[PDB]
């Protein structure tokens, strides 16, 4: 029971710089992109109804 | 990986809720 | 002791109709019971009934035709205005297509539609459907 370790994990976490990426669309264009990704594109579907951020 | 199998095995484990969600995704929707 | 002889009559009719009986005995009879029964019968919900006259307080033998789901009394007899009638209908009746709320108004004992036709309110006696 000591306060010596108070920022341990955040302090010892290796620092990774954020990568540069093109800006995300905002407003009506973002909603248009979401609608197109969910209702006009079917190629990602394979019959399993997997999630949009599936990793396996 | 078949989510029916994953639910059968891991339903009582730390990932029971996740395998339940994956099973429900596969069961209805296509 | 017994208050609200109409409550007793309606409960007896309900209990007999739920057992699938063809007739039900009601005692004591009263003018309000006879008027409520007449309203029920004019809409085809009970059928003919006979008033047995003993010299104290009559009885009624009501012929049951199994078209009745529930006949009930509303105690106390709340005063009902023409505005509150829609809320009472929503509370009591199973549908807007059928079922009746019986009121006692100065124009007599009548269902709620007839009370709307005569543009009158009164006191709620009960309901049947």
């Amino acid at each position: 029971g000591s306060l010596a370790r108070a920022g341990k994990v955040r302090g010892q976490t290796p620092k990774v710089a954020k990568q540069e990426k093109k800006k995300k669309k905002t407003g009506r264009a973002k909603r248009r992109m979401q609608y197109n990704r969910r209702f006009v594109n079917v190629v990602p579907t394979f019959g399993k109804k997997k999630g949009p951020n599936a990793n396996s | 990986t078949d989510p029916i199998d994953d639910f059968q095995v891991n339903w009582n484990t730390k990932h029971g809720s996740g395998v339940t969600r994956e099973l429900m995704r596969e069961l209805n929707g296509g | 002791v017994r208050m609200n002889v109409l409550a007793d009559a309606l409960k007896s009719i309900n209990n007999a109709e739920k057992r699938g009986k063809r007739q039900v005995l009601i005692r004591p009879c009263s003018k309000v019971i006879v008027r409520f029964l007449t309203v029920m019968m004019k809409h085809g919900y009970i059928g003919e009934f006979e008033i047995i006259d003993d010299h104290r307080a009559g009885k009624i033998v009501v012929n049951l035709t199994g078209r009745l789901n529930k006949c009930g009394v509303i105690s106390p007899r709340f005063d009902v205005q023409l505005k509150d009638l829609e809320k009472w209908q929503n509370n009591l009746l199973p549908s807007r297509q059928f079922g009746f709320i019986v009121l006692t108004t100065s124009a007599g004992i009548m269902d709620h539609e007839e009370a709307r036709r005569k543009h009158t309110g009164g006191k709620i006696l009960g309901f049947f459907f």
């Binding site: 000591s2 306060l3 370790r5 108070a6 920022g7 341990k8 955040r10 | - | 105690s75 106390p76 007899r77």
Partner: protein, 141 residues
């Protein structure tokens, strides 16, 4: 059963009014003892002075040291214990400096495995803990 009479309005209203006091939340809100006992005194937030850093042990199923601070409220001189939420945030707090503390989210009840602690630090030295945590701001010098 209950009374159904056209002249029972006094009976019904009075019985409801007496029976509402057996509602724990209604009694807590309307008796005035809880407001008196509340260190914030009905306020959502309160400013206080940090007296010392205290480490609070998490309850038995878990195991950790919850880094809290004892603070004395300026408004009424009461001493409370307030959680310092995120990690390393106890390093943002010194002794004898002013902190804004809010409730912990259960309306006066302890949250999670932190016994007897129902407050959390929001600001320190007029700078939010979120700004210091994210590096958007630095504590004054």
């Amino acid at each position: 059963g209950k009374c159904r009479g056209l002249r029972t309005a006094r009976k019904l209203r009075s019985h409801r009014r007496d029976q509402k006091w057996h509602d724990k939340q209604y009694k807590k809100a309307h008796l005035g003892t809880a407001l008196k006992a509340n260190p914030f005194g009905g306020a959502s937030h309160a400013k206080g002075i940090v007296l010392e850093k205290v480490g609070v042990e998490a309850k038995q199923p878990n195991s950790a040291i919850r880094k809290c601070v004892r603070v004395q409220l300026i408004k009424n001189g009461k001493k409370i214990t307030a959680f310092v939420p995120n990690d390393g945030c106890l390093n943002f707090i010194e002794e004898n400096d002013e902190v804004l503390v809010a409730g912990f989210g259960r309306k006066g009840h302890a949250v999670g495995d932190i016994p007897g602690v129902r407050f959390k630090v929001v600001k320190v030295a007029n700078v939010s803990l979120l700004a210091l945590y994210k590096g958007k701001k630095e504590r004054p010098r």
